[PDB]
């Protein structure tokens, strides 16, 4: 299956998590900083190390 | 970790853009519809395709 379809579907879910956390009253930088860690981890293991 | 750190720096900066747009009156999911495409594009162009 296409790696980009998989990544885009992961990002869709990431967006839901952000909407849910914002509704709970968490500050965006706090939510986003956790999300950045997850996305970087996703790419680190699903895409070859960049040149 | 230059390419991986360059990617994390990119996403942290994407976070500031998102908050600035939301502080400008825009809704997160509207911003996210465009941000997910920009993030997928970044990885497709700057990282090799998975084998």
XYZ file of N, CA and C in Angstrom:
306
model
N 0.863 -1.210 0.000
C 0.000 0.000 0.000
C 0.889 1.246 0.000
N 0.398 2.342 -0.544
C 1.223 3.548 -0.760
C 1.660 4.127 0.588
N 2.963 4.431 0.753
C 3.468 4.998 1.995
C 2.835 6.364 2.257
N 2.516 7.100 1.185
C 1.936 8.434 1.373
C 0.480 8.320 1.807
N -0.280 7.381 1.270
C -1.657 7.165 1.779
C -1.579 6.878 3.283
N -0.655 6.004 3.672
C -0.533 5.608 5.090
C -0.187 6.846 5.923
N 0.768 7.642 5.478
C 1.158 8.817 6.241
C -0.010 9.791 6.306
N -0.725 9.972 5.211
C -1.815 10.971 5.216
C -2.888 10.487 6.209
N -3.154 9.180 6.257
C -4.168 8.668 7.170
C -3.724 8.830 8.622
N -2.432 8.646 8.886
C -1.870 8.957 10.199
C -2.088 10.427 10.565
N -1.829 11.339 9.620
C -2.013 12.777 9.893
C -3.469 13.164 10.140
N -4.395 12.538 9.410
C -5.817 12.733 9.684
C -6.128 12.457 11.146
N -5.701 11.299 11.639
C -5.921 10.952 13.021
C -5.241 11.947 13.954
N -4.046 12.425 13.573
C -3.304 13.389 14.387
C -4.151 14.639 14.554
N -4.760 15.087 13.466
C -5.634 16.247 13.550
C -6.780 16.077 14.537
N -7.423 14.897 14.535
C -8.479 14.617 15.534
C -7.923 14.774 16.951
N -6.756 14.211 17.229
C -6.167 14.303 18.586
C -5.990 15.779 18.959
N -5.521 16.599 18.028
C -5.280 18.041 18.301
C -6.624 18.712 18.615
N -7.662 18.447 17.830
C -9.003 19.071 18.030
C -9.492 18.699 19.435
N -9.328 17.432 19.804
C -9.799 16.923 21.108
C -9.041 17.627 22.236
N -7.732 17.796 22.095
C -6.901 18.427 23.149
C -7.243 19.923 23.252
N -7.430 20.610 22.130
C -7.799 22.050 22.151
C -9.144 22.210 22.876
N -10.120 21.351 22.585
C -11.454 21.384 23.248
C -11.273 21.236 24.765
N -10.271 20.489 25.227
C -9.986 20.286 26.672
C -9.305 21.509 27.282
N -8.925 22.505 26.484
C -8.371 23.772 26.998
C -6.860 23.810 27.076
N -6.174 22.802 26.536
C -4.689 22.767 26.496
C -4.172 23.828 25.522
N -3.027 24.432 25.824
C -2.403 25.463 24.964
C -1.862 24.783 23.698
N -1.981 25.420 22.540
C -1.606 24.800 21.240
C -0.125 24.395 21.180
N 0.789 25.239 21.669
C 2.244 24.935 21.589
C 2.497 23.631 22.352
N 1.816 23.465 23.488
C 2.004 22.237 24.301
C 1.540 21.027 23.487
N 0.326 21.088 22.950
C -0.237 19.962 22.149
C 0.661 19.741 20.938
N 0.981 20.807 20.229
C 1.747 20.718 18.968
C 3.120 20.110 19.220
N 3.791 20.486 20.293
C 5.155 19.996 20.601
C 5.119 18.473 20.786
N 4.082 17.946 21.419
C 3.906 16.481 21.578
C 3.620 15.880 20.199
N 2.777 16.547 19.414
C 2.457 16.027 18.115
C 3.694 15.975 17.200
N 4.558 16.984 17.303
C 5.762 17.033 16.465
C 6.626 15.816 16.744
N 6.757 15.491 18.016
C 7.546 14.315 18.445
C 6.987 13.071 17.754
N 5.667 12.912 17.743
C 5.052 11.717 17.152
C 5.268 11.641 15.648
N 5.138 12.800 14.951
C 5.252 12.811 13.519
C 6.669 12.505 13.126
N 7.627 13.075 13.851
C 9.073 12.871 13.589
C 9.379 11.390 13.834
N 8.787 10.805 14.877
C 9.007 9.358 15.128
C 8.441 8.504 13.991
N 7.208 8.827 13.551
C 6.575 8.153 12.406
C 7.476 8.151 11.183
N 8.004 9.328 10.803
C 8.831 9.489 9.564
C 10.181 8.799 9.745
N 10.761 8.902 10.930
C 12.055 8.270 11.270
C 11.984 6.757 11.005
N 10.857 6.108 11.311
C 10.725 4.653 11.102
C 10.049 4.200 9.796
N 9.288 5.061 9.108
C 8.633 4.686 7.864
C 9.309 5.198 6.593
N 10.248 6.114 6.684
C 10.967 6.591 5.487
C 12.471 6.441 5.681
N 13.186 6.081 4.602
C 14.615 5.948 4.677
C 15.264 7.248 5.157
N 16.378 7.134 5.871
C 17.133 8.319 6.344
C 17.422 9.202 5.130
N 17.101 10.509 5.166
C 17.284 11.368 4.008
C 18.765 11.569 3.693
N 19.128 11.841 2.425
C 20.543 11.941 2.050
C 21.276 13.116 2.728
N 22.147 14.244 12.580
C 20.693 14.142 12.297
C 20.228 15.347 11.496
N 21.001 15.834 10.529
C 20.649 17.124 9.883
C 19.270 17.027 9.233
N 19.010 16.088 8.304
C 17.729 16.026 7.601
C 16.557 15.790 8.563
N 16.763 14.950 9.577
C 15.734 14.651 10.607
C 15.520 15.875 11.499
N 16.587 16.591 11.842
C 16.496 17.828 12.658
C 15.926 18.949 11.788
N 16.282 19.009 10.512
C 15.717 20.016 9.580
C 14.208 19.789 9.500
N 13.777 18.535 9.499
C 12.340 18.184 9.410
C 11.638 18.640 10.695
N 12.229 18.357 11.854
C 11.622 18.742 13.159
C 11.565 20.272 13.281
N 12.589 20.988 12.814
C 12.602 22.473 12.815
C 11.465 22.965 11.912
N 11.301 22.346 10.758
C 10.210 22.691 9.821
C 8.867 22.539 10.534
N 8.649 21.418 11.209
C 7.331 21.198 11.831
C 7.096 22.106 12.996
N 8.155 22.397 13.782
C 7.960 23.355 14.874
C 7.519 24.695 14.271
N 8.173 25.112 13.179
C 7.785 26.393 12.561
C 6.363 26.345 11.996
N 5.940 25.171 11.538
C 4.574 24.975 10.988
C 3.611 25.225 12.155
N 3.980 24.797 13.362
C 3.153 25.044 14.556
C 2.901 26.532 14.778
N 3.937 27.359 14.658
C 3.800 28.828 14.863
C 2.851 29.386 13.789
N 2.991 28.944 12.543
C 2.117 29.401 11.435
C 0.670 29.069 11.799
N 0.419 27.846 12.261
C -0.956 27.383 12.589
C -1.520 28.300 13.674
N -0.771 28.537 14.746
C -1.284 29.347 15.892
C -1.523 30.791 15.428
N -0.663 31.281 14.549
C -0.799 32.692 14.067
C -2.095 32.809 13.237
N -2.364 31.795 12.419
C -3.595 31.752 11.587
C -4.820 31.647 12.495
N -4.758 30.827 13.542
C -5.893 30.623 14.471
C -6.082 31.893 15.308
N -4.993 32.554 15.695
C -5.073 33.838 16.428
C -5.565 34.911 15.447
N -5.519 34.636 14.134
C -6.009 35.554 13.069
C -7.487 35.276 12.770
N -8.088 34.280 13.413
C -9.532 34.003 13.284
C -9.850 32.728 12.526
N -8.846 32.021 12.008
C -9.071 30.811 11.185
C -9.327 29.601 12.087
N -10.082 28.619 11.589
C -10.412 27.380 12.343
C -9.342 26.314 12.090
N -8.968 25.550 13.108
C -7.859 24.567 13.012
C -8.062 23.597 11.852
N -9.185 22.908 11.764
C -9.445 21.861 10.750
C -9.357 22.468 9.349
N -9.696 23.738 9.159
C -9.538 24.421 7.845
C -8.042 24.560 7.557
N -7.279 25.018 8.543
C -5.802 25.143 8.403
C -5.227 23.743 8.158
N -5.650 22.738 8.922
C -5.116 21.351 8.863
C -5.306 20.720 7.480
N -6.388 21.044 6.791
C -6.677 20.505 5.441
C -5.518 20.865 4.515
N -4.917 22.036 4.714
C -3.781 22.498 3.885
C -2.460 22.036 4.518
N -2.339 22.059 5.839
C -1.059 21.724 6.523
C -0.683 20.262 6.262
N -1.643 19.343 6.326
C -1.373 17.888 6.127
C -0.779 17.689 4.726
N -1.286 18.423 3.739
C -0.813 18.303 2.336
C 0.616 18.846 2.258
N 0.891 19.958 2.920
C 2.254 20.552 2.951
C 3.238 19.619 3.680
N 2.805 18.929 4.730
C 3.689 18.005 5.516
C 3.978 16.760 4.676
N 2.958 16.208 4.040
C 3.108 15.003 3.177
C 4.053 15.361 2.025
N 3.886 16.545 1.433
C 4.744 17.032 0.331
C 6.194 17.146 0.810
N 6.431 17.791 1.950
C 7.793 17.909 2.539
C 8.471 16.540 2.584
N 7.821 15.541 3.168
C 8.426 14.181 3.322
C 8.612 13.518 1.948
N 7.659 13.665 1.031
C 7.710 13.023 -0.311
C 8.927 13.561 -1.073
N 9.192 14.850 -0.948
C 10.288 15.525 -1.683
C 11.633 15.355 -0.980
N 11.708 15.556 0.333
C 12.996 15.602 1.073
C 13.483 14.239 1.576
N 12.635 13.239 1.619
C 13.009 11.882 2.067
C 12.871 10.928 0.884
N 13.755 9.930 0.747
C 13.580 8.925 -0.283
C 12.268 8.158 -0.084
N 11.692 7.597 -1.149
C 10.489 6.746 -1.031
C 10.909 5.461 -0.312
N 10.045 4.892 0.540
C 10.387 3.650 1.219
C 10.541 2.517 0.237
N 11.431 1.564 0.508
C 11.618 0.486 -0.452
C 10.748 -0.722 -0.110
